Amino acid sequence: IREHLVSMLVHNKPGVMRKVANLFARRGFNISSITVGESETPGLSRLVIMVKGDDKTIEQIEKQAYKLVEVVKVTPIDPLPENRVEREMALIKVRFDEDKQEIFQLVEIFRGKIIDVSREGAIIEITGARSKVEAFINLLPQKQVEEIARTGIVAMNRWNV
Amino acid sequence: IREHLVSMLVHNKPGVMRKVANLFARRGFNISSITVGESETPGLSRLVIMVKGDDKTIEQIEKQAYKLVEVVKVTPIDPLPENRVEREMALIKVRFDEDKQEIFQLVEIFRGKIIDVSREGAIIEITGARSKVEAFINLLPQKQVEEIARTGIVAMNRWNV
Numbered sequence A, B: 001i002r003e004h005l006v007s008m009l010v011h012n013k014p015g016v017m018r019k020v021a022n023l024f025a026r027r028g029f030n031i032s033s034i035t036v037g038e039s040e041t042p043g044l045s046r047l048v049i050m051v052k053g054d055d056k057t058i059e060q061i062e063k064q065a066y067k068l069v070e071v072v073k074v075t076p077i078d079p080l081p082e083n084r085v086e087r088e089m090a091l092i093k094v095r096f097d098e099d100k101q102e103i104f105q106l107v108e109i110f111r112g113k114i115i116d117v118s119r120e121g122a123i124i125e126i127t128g129a130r131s132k133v134e135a136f137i138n139l140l141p142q143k144q145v146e147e148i149a150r151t152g153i154v155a156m157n158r159w160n161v
């Protein structure tokens, strides 16, 4: 009923992602997005998970994650969009068809970056809220999009104001 | 012995990530990084995996992935760094300590973005090659880094030149 966001600090060693995927699958969790990479603490990874569910969802995930010994801190992200930041990044390969200029214009308007060009097309890098990224993707001529590689959402609570 | 990069298109439904994590764990694959999100084809996700291994590594992963019926295309990424693009994104929460100006300068030099500020600190968004992202993170006063949330690597082959 609402998408929820949770950040999670896990001891990083061989076999660990296998474990958290298992726990989430064999608990009936509807995961929409997952991000994973090094954290602020060397030796610990941070995962951001978005899960589609009800208001008991965050408690549930908390309770169940903590049963992996490797799960060392679970941090819910504020449900108020005003209280957090959310970002996604996409790499987009587009072929030109007499429209170099419309495409480059679009990249400029969205503050994207061209990171590869040939006579045939470009690769564009785009970062922003998920709805900026998607709005951008949808504005491209769909027959000309060759490839799209996307991260999930990274999110964090804002500084308290 | 070398890090290898592979892109992979998978049918996206409940239980799917569980499966590919299982196959990779119970095959002895040393996964350094994983990215996942929607692809250019609606209904299919694209995953980018980096795996530390020998020259048989890409074949192996190919052979073994294809045994999940949901794995629908495996694309190795060019091993020549000249032939591909690689990008990572990080969200970084930093506390100020009489050094607003050094920090903002640093963000400008790395073409990062300030996406949250208070009197206490900022959240910085940074995108680039993994060594630009890490060089940036290492340049911050380590006692002042509160939080770091990172995607893995997204990668793609360049247009043929």
Ligand SMILES: [Mg+2]
Residues within 6 Å of the ligand: A066, A068, A069, A070, A071, A072
């Ligand atoms: Mg514990």
Ligand SMILES: [Mg+2]
Residues within 6 Å of the ligand: B066, B068, B069, B070, B071, B072
């Ligand atoms: Mg098949």
